[PDB]
mmCIF file of C-alpha atoms and ligand atoms in Angstrom:
data_model
loop_
_atom_site.group_PDB
_atom_site.id
_atom_site.type_symbol
_atom_site.label_atom_id
_atom_site.label_comp_id
_atom_site.label_asym_id
_atom_site.label_seq_id
_atom_site.Cartn_x
_atom_site.Cartn_y
_atom_site.Cartn_z
ATOM 1 C CA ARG A 1 111.692 106.416 110.086
ATOM 2 C CA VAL A 2 108.201 107.744 109.309
ATOM 3 C CA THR A 3 107.971 111.162 107.632
ATOM 4 C CA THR A 4 104.999 113.170 106.371
ATOM 5 C CA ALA A 5 106.334 112.654 102.836
ATOM 6 C CA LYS A 6 106.244 108.870 103.213
ATOM 7 C CA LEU A 7 102.832 109.028 104.935
ATOM 8 C CA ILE A 8 101.277 111.128 102.170
ATOM 9 C CA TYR A 9 102.941 108.870 99.589
ATOM 10 C CA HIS A 10 101.517 105.626 100.991
ATOM 11 C CA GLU A 11 98.098 107.251 101.374
ATOM 12 C CA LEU A 12 98.026 108.537 97.790
ATOM 13 C CA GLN A 13 99.575 105.323 96.495
ATOM 14 C CA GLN A 14 96.946 103.197 98.240
ATOM 15 C CA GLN A 15 94.096 105.309 96.859
ATOM 16 C CA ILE A 16 95.462 104.764 93.353
ATOM 17 C CA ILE A 17 96.100 101.027 93.853
ATOM 18 C CA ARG A 18 92.585 100.536 95.264
ATOM 19 C CA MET A 19 91.007 102.480 92.380
ATOM 20 C CA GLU A 20 89.575 105.068 94.778
ATOM 21 C CA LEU A 21 91.369 107.667 92.632
ATOM 22 C CA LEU A 22 90.506 106.540 89.105
ATOM 23 C CA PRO A 23 92.885 107.049 86.148
ATOM 24 C CA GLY A 24 92.755 110.634 84.922
ATOM 25 C CA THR A 25 91.749 112.097 88.287
ATOM 26 C CA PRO A 26 93.778 115.309 88.677
ATOM 27 C CA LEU A 27 95.992 115.839 91.710
ATOM 28 C CA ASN A 28 96.254 119.445 92.857
ATOM 29 C CA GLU A 29 99.362 120.262 94.869
ATOM 30 C CA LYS A 30 97.611 123.336 96.279
ATOM 31 C CA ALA A 31 94.558 121.279 97.250
ATOM 32 C CA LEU A 32 96.732 118.467 98.634
ATOM 33 C CA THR A 33 98.820 120.890 100.704
ATOM 34 C CA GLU A 34 95.638 122.304 102.237
ATOM 35 C CA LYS A 35 94.194 118.839 102.928
ATOM 36 C CA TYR A 36 97.195 117.438 104.812
ATOM 37 C CA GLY A 37 98.006 120.657 106.679
ATOM 38 C CA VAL A 38 101.748 120.365 106.084
ATOM 39 C CA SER A 39 104.030 122.252 103.687
ATOM 40 C CA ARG A 40 103.933 121.949 99.914
ATOM 41 C CA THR A 41 107.355 120.271 100.134
ATOM 42 C CA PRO A 42 106.301 116.754 101.296
ATOM 43 C CA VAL A 43 103.503 116.749 98.706
ATOM 44 C CA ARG A 44 105.989 117.310 95.875
ATOM 45 C CA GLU A 45 108.275 114.557 97.180
ATOM 46 C CA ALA A 46 105.393 112.072 97.246
ATOM 47 C CA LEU A 47 104.149 112.946 93.754
ATOM 48 C CA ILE A 48 107.693 112.512 92.395
ATOM 49 C CA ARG A 49 107.949 108.993 93.831
ATOM 50 C CA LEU A 50 104.475 108.077 92.562
ATOM 51 C CA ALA A 51 105.527 109.173 89.076
ATOM 52 C CA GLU A 52 108.542 106.843 89.247
ATOM 53 C CA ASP A 53 106.086 104.099 90.223
ATOM 54 C CA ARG A 54 104.272 104.923 86.938
ATOM 55 C CA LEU A 55 101.184 105.542 89.104
ATOM 56 C CA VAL A 56 100.784 109.228 88.153
ATOM 57 C CA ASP A 57 101.448 111.190 84.964
ATOM 58 C CA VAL A 58 103.256 114.539 85.067
ATOM 59 C CA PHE A 59 101.898 116.277 81.971
ATOM 60 C CA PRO A 60 104.367 119.206 81.980
ATOM 61 C CA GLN A 61 102.027 122.102 81.109
ATOM 62 C CA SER A 62 98.745 120.757 82.484
ATOM 63 C CA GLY A 63 99.237 119.192 85.908
ATOM 64 C CA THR A 64 99.615 115.809 87.590
ATOM 65 C CA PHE A 65 96.975 113.136 87.076
ATOM 66 C CA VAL A 66 96.575 109.496 88.043
ATOM 67 C CA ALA A 67 98.157 107.383 85.320
ATOM 68 C CA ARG A 68 96.500 104.619 83.336
ATOM 69 C CA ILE A 69 97.297 100.942 83.920
ATOM 70 C CA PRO A 70 100.247 100.043 81.631
ATOM 71 C CA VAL A 71 99.275 96.968 79.639
ATOM 72 C CA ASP A 72 102.757 96.022 78.363
ATOM 73 C CA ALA A 73 104.180 95.356 81.849
ATOM 74 C CA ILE A 74 101.314 93.122 83.063
ATOM 75 C CA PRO A 75 102.571 89.772 81.633
ATOM 76 C CA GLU A 76 106.051 90.199 83.143
ATOM 77 C CA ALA A 77 104.414 90.968 86.499
ATOM 78 C CA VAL A 78 102.407 87.730 86.333
ATOM 79 C CA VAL A 79 105.495 85.649 85.531
ATOM 80 C CA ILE A 80 107.454 87.198 88.407
ATOM 81 C CA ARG A 81 104.499 86.545 90.704
ATOM 82 C CA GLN A 82 104.022 83.015 89.360
ATOM 83 C CA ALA A 83 107.707 82.370 90.026
ATOM 84 C CA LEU A 84 107.942 83.909 93.504
ATOM 85 C CA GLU A 85 104.544 82.700 94.701
ATOM 86 C CA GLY A 86 105.232 79.387 93.006
ATOM 87 C CA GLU A 87 108.223 79.196 95.341
ATOM 88 C CA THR A 88 106.347 80.176 98.514
ATOM 89 C CA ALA A 89 103.702 77.589 97.568
ATOM 90 C CA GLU A 90 106.326 74.838 97.145
ATOM 91 C CA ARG A 91 107.867 75.592 100.515
ATOM 92 C CA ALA A 92 104.561 76.076 102.360
ATOM 93 C CA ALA A 93 103.546 72.536 101.393
ATOM 94 C CA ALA A 94 106.844 71.212 102.748
ATOM 95 C CA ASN A 95 106.576 73.189 106.013
ATOM 96 C CA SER A 96 102.883 72.407 106.470
ATOM 97 C CA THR A 97 101.767 71.962 110.052
ATOM 98 C CA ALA A 98 98.089 71.497 110.859
ATOM 99 C CA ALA A 99 97.941 74.763 112.818
ATOM 100 C CA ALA A 100 99.122 76.495 109.654
ATOM 101 C CA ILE A 101 96.292 74.917 107.631
ATOM 102 C CA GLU A 102 93.884 76.158 110.292
ATOM 103 C CA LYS A 103 95.196 79.688 109.717
ATOM 104 C CA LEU A 104 94.546 79.265 105.977
ATOM 105 C CA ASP A 105 91.092 77.753 106.549
ATOM 106 C CA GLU A 106 90.242 80.636 108.877
ATOM 107 C CA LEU A 107 91.131 83.058 106.067
ATOM 108 C CA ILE A 108 89.167 81.092 103.460
ATOM 109 C CA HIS A 109 86.089 81.171 105.682
ATOM 110 C CA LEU A 110 86.627 84.920 106.075
ATOM 111 C CA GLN A 111 86.793 85.350 102.293
ATOM 112 C CA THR A 112 83.664 83.228 101.864
ATOM 113 C CA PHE A 113 81.902 85.617 104.252
ATOM 114 C CA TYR A 114 82.832 88.691 102.226
ATOM 115 C CA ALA A 115 81.738 86.916 99.042
ATOM 116 C CA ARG A 116 78.384 85.955 100.600
ATOM 117 C CA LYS A 117 77.906 89.553 101.745
ATOM 118 C CA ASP A 118 79.036 90.897 98.338
ATOM 119 C CA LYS A 119 81.779 92.964 99.999
ATOM 120 C CA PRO A 120 84.622 92.772 97.441
ATOM 121 C CA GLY A 121 86.932 95.280 99.164
ATOM 122 C CA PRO A 122 87.465 93.229 102.308
ATOM 123 C CA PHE A 123 87.493 90.239 99.959
ATOM 124 C CA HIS A 124 90.541 91.658 98.204
ATOM 125 C CA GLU A 125 92.280 92.447 101.497
ATOM 126 C CA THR A 126 91.686 88.932 102.816
ATOM 127 C CA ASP A 127 93.034 87.688 99.484
ATOM 128 C CA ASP A 128 96.331 89.450 100.229
ATOM 129 C CA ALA A 129 96.343 88.022 103.767
ATOM 130 C CA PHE A 130 95.838 84.513 102.361
ATOM 131 C CA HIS A 131 98.945 84.855 100.187
ATOM 132 C CA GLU A 132 100.926 86.613 102.925
ATOM 133 C CA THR A 133 100.266 83.589 105.136
ATOM 134 C CA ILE A 134 101.498 81.224 102.419
ATOM 135 C CA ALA A 135 104.748 83.196 102.543
ATOM 136 C CA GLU A 136 104.911 82.937 106.343
ATOM 137 C CA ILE A 137 104.448 79.154 106.138
ATOM 138 C CA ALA A 138 107.204 78.893 103.517
ATOM 139 C CA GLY A 139 109.601 80.698 105.847
ATOM 140 C CA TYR A 140 110.111 83.807 103.696
ATOM 141 C CA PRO A 141 107.422 86.360 104.601
ATOM 142 C CA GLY A 142 109.615 89.042 103.044
ATOM 143 C CA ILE A 143 108.918 87.499 99.644
ATOM 144 C CA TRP A 144 105.384 88.817 100.099
ATOM 145 C CA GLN A 145 106.594 92.319 100.950
ATOM 146 C CA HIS A 146 108.845 92.036 97.901
ATOM 147 C CA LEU A 147 105.868 91.503 95.558
ATOM 148 C CA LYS A 148 103.835 94.509 96.762
ATOM 149 C CA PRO A 149 105.263 96.868 94.086
ATOM 150 C CA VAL A 150 105.185 94.109 91.444
ATOM 151 C CA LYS A 151 101.464 93.401 91.768
ATOM 152 C CA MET A 152 100.394 97.071 91.866
ATOM 153 C CA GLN A 153 98.921 97.157 88.367
ATOM 154 C CA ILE A 154 97.416 93.661 88.658
ATOM 155 C CA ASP A 155 95.641 94.792 91.835
ATOM 156 C CA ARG A 156 94.153 97.772 89.998
ATOM 157 C CA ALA A 157 92.820 95.452 87.300
ATOM 158 C CA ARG A 158 91.518 92.911 89.804
ATOM 159 C CA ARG A 159 89.591 95.632 91.649
ATOM 160 C CA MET A 160 87.481 95.781 88.472
ATOM 161 C CA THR A 161 87.128 92.029 87.875
ATOM 162 C CA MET A 162 86.008 90.990 91.390
ATOM 163 C CA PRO A 163 82.469 92.503 91.259
ATOM 164 C CA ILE A 164 81.906 90.538 88.016
ATOM 165 C CA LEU A 165 79.418 87.733 88.570
ATOM 166 C CA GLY A 166 80.960 84.540 89.897
ATOM 167 C CA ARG A 167 84.519 85.867 90.229
ATOM 168 C CA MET A 168 84.962 85.816 94.019
ATOM 169 C CA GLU A 169 83.492 82.307 94.055
ATOM 170 C CA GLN A 170 86.040 81.273 91.428
ATOM 171 C CA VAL A 171 88.821 82.745 93.587
ATOM 172 C CA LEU A 172 87.588 80.727 96.579
ATOM 173 C CA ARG A 173 87.655 77.551 94.482
ATOM 174 C CA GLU A 174 91.218 78.345 93.411
ATOM 175 C CA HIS A 175 92.238 79.037 97.015
ATOM 176 C CA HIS A 176 90.794 75.690 98.120
ATOM 177 C CA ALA A 177 92.987 74.007 95.508
ATOM 178 C CA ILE A 178 96.084 75.748 96.879
ATOM 179 C CA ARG A 179 95.212 74.942 100.495
ATOM 180 C CA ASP A 180 94.429 71.289 99.783
ATOM 181 C CA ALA A 181 97.834 70.847 98.127
ATOM 182 C CA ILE A 182 99.659 72.604 100.973
ATOM 183 C CA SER A 183 97.811 70.484 103.536
ATOM 184 C CA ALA A 184 98.779 67.373 101.551
ATOM 185 C CA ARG A 185 102.445 68.499 101.509
ATOM 186 C CA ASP A 186 102.319 68.016 97.701
ATOM 187 C CA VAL A 187 105.113 70.373 96.632
ATOM 188 C CA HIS A 188 104.355 70.013 92.923
ATOM 189 C CA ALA A 189 100.573 70.321 93.280
ATOM 190 C CA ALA A 190 101.032 73.425 95.433
ATOM 191 C CA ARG A 191 103.249 75.179 92.875
ATOM 192 C CA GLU A 192 100.974 74.447 89.913
ATOM 193 C CA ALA A 193 97.720 75.379 91.687
ATOM 194 C CA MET A 194 99.311 78.684 92.710
ATOM 195 C CA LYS A 195 100.671 79.346 89.213
ATOM 196 C CA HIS A 196 97.252 78.534 87.719
ATOM 197 C CA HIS A 197 95.328 80.787 90.125
ATOM 198 C CA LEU A 198 97.673 83.666 89.255
ATOM 199 C CA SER A 199 97.199 83.296 85.469
ATOM 200 C CA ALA A 200 93.477 84.124 85.724
ATOM 201 C CA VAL A 201 94.345 87.834 85.599
ATOM 202 C CA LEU A 202 95.514 87.664 81.977
ATOM 203 C CA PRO A 203 92.205 86.955 80.166
ATOM 204 C CA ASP A 204 90.358 89.324 82.514
ATOM 205 C CA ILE A 205 92.499 92.308 81.483
ATOM 206 C CA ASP A 206 92.078 91.510 77.784
ATOM 207 C CA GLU A 207 88.344 91.875 78.404
ATOM 208 C CA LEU A 208 88.640 94.999 80.573
ATOM 209 C CA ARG A 209 90.732 96.786 77.936
ATOM 210 C CA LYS A 210 87.903 96.460 75.406
ATOM 211 C CA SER A 211 85.227 97.242 78.021
ATOM 212 C CA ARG A 212 86.818 100.256 79.754
ATOM 213 C CA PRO A 213 89.688 101.384 77.502
ATOM 214 C CA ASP A 214 90.023 104.688 79.381
ATOM 215 C CA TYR A 215 91.652 102.802 82.294
ATOM 216 C CA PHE A 216 94.477 101.240 80.245
ATOM 217 C CA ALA A 217 97.332 102.602 78.153
HETATM 218 ZN ZN1 ZN B 301 94.397 84.804 95.561
#
């Protein structure tokens, strides 16, 4: 069931994952309690969970702040995603009806629109929907829900790489490769195009760490 603790949690979590609250931004329990209009109790419960997510840092005699993106865990997150989304890609090709490909094409056209209009936020959200639909076609949409905590730090990094020149267009090219393989029912080609697409995050973060080292730790 929904509680104010879970609702505050998901709201704060989302703001951190979408880089609306940048790393180092303090979080004031007094100011949060006033904002939400509920007790100080559900605020504490949410901050505790966020700390376990490694999303916030509890500096004991200072306060809570938004944590930096841990670099050591990124490669393991890509492998897990390559494996799970490699699976959903394999199965989506096998279960490929034409009405499913239409659903993918509709989402690619929607991404193309956000790229044309240089709106990278909606571009990222339609990116998630594109992958969520691969999981629905494969028959295991829960695999997508399963990855949501895994790809938290990757999503923070990708929020910073999308505005870079030519990046959304590269994503669209990679998505076309994945769709074409699924439409062709090529189980191998689907897996490898998906695993390739997902590896693009690794060089980008190497660059970001040099560029903006205050966002990584
Ligand atoms: Zn994608």
